[PDB]
RNA sequence: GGCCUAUCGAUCCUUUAUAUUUGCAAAAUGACGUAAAUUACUUACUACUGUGCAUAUAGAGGUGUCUGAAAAGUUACCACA
RNA sequence: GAUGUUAGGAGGGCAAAUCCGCCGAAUUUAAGCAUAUAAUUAAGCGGAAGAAAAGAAAAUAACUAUGAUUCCUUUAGUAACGGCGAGUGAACAAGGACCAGCUCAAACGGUUAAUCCUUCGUUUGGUGCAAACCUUUCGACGGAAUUGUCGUUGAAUUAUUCCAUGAAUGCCUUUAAUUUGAGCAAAGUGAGCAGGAAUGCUUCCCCAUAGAGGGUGAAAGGCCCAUAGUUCUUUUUAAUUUAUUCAUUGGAAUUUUUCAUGUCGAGUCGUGUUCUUUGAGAUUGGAGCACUAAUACGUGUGAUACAUUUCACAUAAAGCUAAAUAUA
């Protein structure tokens, strides 16, 4: 029988959280990655917009 | 979790990694820690020796804060001081740094390590080791007993 | 609790509230306070002070966070 | 138990399954608490609902250095302030009746804190436009221009929070102003040893005094 | 261990008078009732038995008296206190 | 220790030995010892400080189903695995 | 003490998730079993509420001390308890949520109980369509109670400073929040193709602060209800705005100076004993019984039985109290 005892959540650590945001922003920066992610980048006129 | 489990490796396998001859049944020596000294004596002796018996007097309400002990070694005493400040003390022969170890959170100063030779320092603390005291005197520092 | 003088009187008046139905059977009387140990305070009352039921339930209770 | 495994210390032998609770209300409960206090403050005209504590010492050998918010100022500190108990209830200062005001240094610090609050405080007229000098060491009734001008501004509530202490404490001392004389380890052991001799002497002193 | 009001503490923080630097700042109507109530109530039989032992006044009887009083009232202190009341009554009785 | 190869027993407990080593939780029980002081809660300096209990270390008191349950019969009335 | 179908009132019973009391097991664990374990759990009998109970020190500390309650984080799987085996197991401190105080009772007031209540009445307000509620002081006539209600919180006395007070005239302005029901609420039912019939496919248009959702003859922003957005009307509770004169009576707080230094809950505590219980250990809490106290310079505490003495802290044996917190 399923019960609410189940470990649904997790502690995600502050330094790790910050790193993920910063690194994702840096990744968002990269033009090749934007296109690979499937964004239709062709007529854009700067690498971060 | 569920998709990587050992049961997923062994899914059609009867006893399934728990012994076909055995035919797997729960706690078959008896519950928990219970077989200790009796049936699991060999395990307890080999892995947890000093487990059985009664040793020492009793102290009925310990109250651990009464006997509280935050220590530092002399080795890390200088480390409570910044690098640039320490350089200024190294430069200036005429002065020494006062260090309030209690204001930095410590009560006892112990004797592990090195104090740099010919370099006075003033150490304020509740407790000091014999060795710590000897080092502080040896290097021309001062020790302050302080509450 | 019904009569006008006691309802009027600001003293004792609290007893007119409906929670005072069967005070002795909730053990709120001096006799009840005694056997529930409510006269006793301090470390002599340590396993009993918020109530015997209350204290035990608090001690029994296992409390888990969502992210633990 | 088997192999290298440590002995367990679980207490799940009793029927814990109806004596267990999991918190899924946390962040919403926090929101509700925020909402409740915000609503309360706003209802009080936006005026402070905060309580100003005395500064008091944390106890025993471990925490004696540290100082925290206490239960209430109590009569000696209030008398030093020039404030009544009734005034203390009327204003935001914390109240008590059995906290002794102890040593001089602590009392002197808390009366200074009271004086700081007393100087800080501005009191809105009781009946609005019927201004009086009034009771209890409470400020005399504010004028209409000032109170309106003050109302527009933020309240300054910094003093409620605990204070900080000396940032470096690395201070200089000249070589010839310190000495190498000291024997701290000896002093400690001797101090404990001579306690018995003193305790006996003090008991005899106490008897003599009492006589 | 005690700080002592007279003579301030040493900074060492062990032994007597030691720790952080600090400065410290530190009937008849009922009696008449009691005598009247005693006129009304007299003495309890155990109180009376103690009075007789005390009146005998020997070291054996006095030793017995404290034991008997401890046994009857509970506690050595209660027994001694009661014995003091009895001695006072015997002093009154003599005069 | 017995010419050699045999002649023996855990934890807990009890008991007697042993200690310039300890404890009984805010404190004390030699001894006001030795000095000074003398209006007194004076001021130093002292290895040896009540009963009782607890320890710590060392034996002994026993478990012969002898790596250690305090344990007699019975069922053709019987049941279950 | 009876008695009354006297006159006026009340209780009964139900419902139970969470709450509060009692009363109260065993399967189970130890690979056996007896102490321990399940567990002060289940069932049983009672009482409550939208929360309940608890709560204003016969408290914790031994500090540079803290200072009603509840709750969380923690101490802590620790001190401790245990065929010291299996197993069990707190509290204080610290960080916080949140915080609220008080009154009987003695004591004090006799050229007057200054109290209390029922019945009869009577008028200064305010709503509502109407029912009707809500304020409001003033007299009777009955009773009750001195076997003690009411006032007072040491006592006067000085200065200061507030609050109740009553009348006339003035005046109820503006907003901001907050919260109901209410409404209004953008563009295509455009070609063409195949189709039972588009909300499909195309293709020409567009609207979006509404491309949430639902319904609509196949997937709809533009078909409808809705939605986003707003216009009010509703809840209360803030700010703003406005009071001015004339009037008695009463109270309270500090502050002087004198004078009063009184007071503080008994078959209860305690002790013994027994049974129970716990962390309580030469007895933690409960309970039965036996013996049974001291009065505030007392006596209750300071977790190993005791005597003898310190020192600190508290004020039992009367009572109430919001909040955070819990809810199958």
3-state secondary structure chain D: CCCCCCCCCCCCCCCHHHCEEEECCHHHHHHHHHHHHHHHHHHCCCCCCCCECCEEECCHHHHCCCEEECCCCHHHHHHHHCCCHHHHHHCCECCCCCCCCCCHHHHHHHHHHHHHHHHHCCCCCCCCCCCCCCCCCCCCCCCHHHHHHHHCCCCCCHHHCCCCCCCCCCCEEEHHHCCCCCCHHHHHHHHHHCHHHHHHHHHHHHHHHHC
Check A9 against C67: CB less than 8 A apart: yes
Residues ≥6 apart with Cβ < 8 Å to B87: none
Mark which residues 38-77 of B lie under 8 Å from E by CB: none
**CA-derived radius of gyration, chain C:** 18
Residues ≥6 apart with Cβ < 8 Å to E12: B145, B147, D187, D188, D191, E18
> Which nucleotide lies closest to B38 by the C1' atom and the CA atom?
F67
* A7 close to C (CB below 8 A): yes
* CA D204/CA D183 separation, integer angstroms: 31
Sign, CA dihedral C12-C17-C22-C23, equals negative
**What resolution in Å is listed for this PDB structure?**
4.7
Give, in Å, how far the C1' of G45 lies from the CA of C32: 18
Give how far Cα D135 sits from Cα of C9, D48, D90, D140, D141, Å: 31, 21, 11, 8, 10
Q: Which tokens go with D203?
A: 């008991």
- Residues B101, B125: contact at Cβ < 8 Å? yes
Residue with tokens 């740094």: B97
Residue with tokens 């006996």: D200
* CA E50/CA E44 separation, integer angstroms: 10
The count of C-alpha atoms lying within 13 angstroms of the C-alpha of E27, restricted to the half-sphere facing its C-beta, is: 6
Q: Which tokens go with B133?
A: 């005291």
**Quick one: DSSP state of residue C42?**
G
Q: Which tokens go with A8?
A: 């649904």
* CA B90/CA B94 separation, integer angstroms: 10
Residue D196 beta carbon within 7 A of nucleic strand G:
no
- Residues E49, E68: contact at Cβ < 8 Å? yes
Give, in Å, how far the C1' of G91 lies from the CA of C62: 19
Q: How far is D6 from chain B (nearest CA, A)?
A: 8
Chains A and E touch (3+ CB pairs under 8 A): no
- Residues D194, E15: contact at Cβ < 8 Å? yes
Interface mutation target, options B77, B130, B141, chain D, most CBs of D under 10 Å: B130
Q: How far is C46 from chain D (nearest CA, A)?
A: 21
Residue D31 beta carbon within 7 A of nucleic strand F:
no
- Residues B142, D182: contact at Cβ < 8 Å? yes
Residue B29 beta carbon within 7 A of nucleic strand G:
yes
Give how far Cα D41 sits from Cα of D46, D50, D91, D128, E30, Å: 5, 9, 15, 20, 55
Structure-determination approach:
cryo-EM
Looking at the partner chain, which of E12, E20, E21 has a beta carbon nearest the beta carbon of B145? E12
Q: How far is D172 from chain E (nearest CA, A)?
A: 22
Residue B59 beta carbon within 7 A of nucleic strand F:
yes
């Amino acid at each position: 029988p399923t019960k609410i005892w189940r470990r649904w959540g997790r502690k995600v650590n502050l330094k790790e959280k910050r790193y993920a945001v910063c690194s994702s922003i840096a990744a968002s920066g990269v033009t090749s990655l934007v296109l690979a992610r499937g964004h239709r980048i062709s007529h854009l006129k700067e690498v971060p917009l | 979790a569920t998709r990587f489990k050992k049961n997923r490796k062994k899914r059609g396998h009867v006893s399934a990694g728990h012994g076909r001859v055995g035919k797997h049944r729960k706690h078959p020596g008896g519950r928990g820690k219970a077989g200790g000294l009796h049936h699991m004596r060999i395990n307890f002796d080999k892995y947890h020796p000093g487990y059985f018996g009664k040793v020492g007097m009793r102290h009925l309400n310990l109250l651990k804060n009464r006997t509280y002990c935050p220590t530092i070694n002399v080795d890390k005493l200088w480390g409570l001081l910044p690098e640039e400040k320490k350089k200024e003390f190294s430069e200036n022969k005429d002065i020494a740094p006062v260090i309030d170890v209690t204001r930095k959170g410590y009560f006892k100063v112990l004797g592990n390590g090195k104090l740099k030779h010919n370099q006075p320092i003033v150490v304020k603390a509740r407790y000091f080791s014999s060795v710590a005291e000897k080092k502080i005197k040896a290097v021309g520092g001062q020790c302050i007993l302080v509450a | 609790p019904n009569h006008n003088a006691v309802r009027n009187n600001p003293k004792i008046n609290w007893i007119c509230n409906p929670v005072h139905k069967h005070r002795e059977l909730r053990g709120l009387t001096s006799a009840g306070k005694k056997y529930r140990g409510l006269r006793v305070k301090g470390h002599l009352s340590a396993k009993s002070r918020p109530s015997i039921r209350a204290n035990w339930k608090r001690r029994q209770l296992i409390k888990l966070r969502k992210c633990r | 138990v088997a192999h290298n495994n440590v002995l367990p210390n679980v207490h799940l032998h009793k029927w814990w399954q109806h004596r267990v609770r999991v918190n899924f209300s946390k962040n919403i409960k926090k929101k509700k608490r925020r909402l409740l206090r915000e609503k309360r403050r706003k209802a009080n005209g936006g005026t402070p609902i905060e309580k100003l504590h005395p500064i008091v010492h944390c106890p025993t050998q471990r925490y004696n250095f540290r100082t925290r918010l206490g239960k209430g100022f109590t009569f000696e500190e209030l008398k030093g302030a020039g404030l009544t108990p009734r005034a203390a209830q009327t204003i935001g200062i914390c109240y008590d009746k059995r906290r002794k005001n102890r040593s001089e240094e602590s009392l002197t610090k808390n009366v200074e804190r009271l004086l700081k609050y007393k100087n800080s405080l501005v009191m809105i007229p009781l009946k609005k436009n019927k201004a009086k000098k009034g009771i209890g060491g409470i400020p005399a009734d504010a004028d209409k221009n000032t109170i309106k001008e003050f109302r527009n501004k933020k309240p300054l509530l910094s003093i409620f929070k605990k204070e900080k202490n000396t940032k470096p404490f690395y201070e200089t001392i000249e070589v010839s102003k310190i000495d190498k004389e000291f024997l701290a380890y000896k002093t400690l052991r001797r101090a404990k040893l001579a306690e018995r001799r003193k305790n006996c002497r003090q008991q005899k002193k106490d008897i003599k005094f009492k006589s | 261990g005690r700080k002592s009001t007279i003579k301030p503490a040493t900074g060492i923080a062990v032994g007597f008078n030691s720790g952080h630097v600090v400065t410290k700042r530190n009937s008849k109507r009922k009696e008449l009732i009691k005598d009247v109530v005693r006129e009304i109530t007299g003495f309890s039989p155990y109180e009376k038995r103690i009075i007789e032992l005390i009146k005998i006044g020997t070291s054996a009887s006095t030793k017995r008296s404290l034991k008997y009083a401890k046994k009857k009232l509970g506690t050595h202190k209660r027994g001694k206190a009661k014995r003091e009341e009895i001695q006072k009554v015997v002093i009154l009785q003599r005069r």
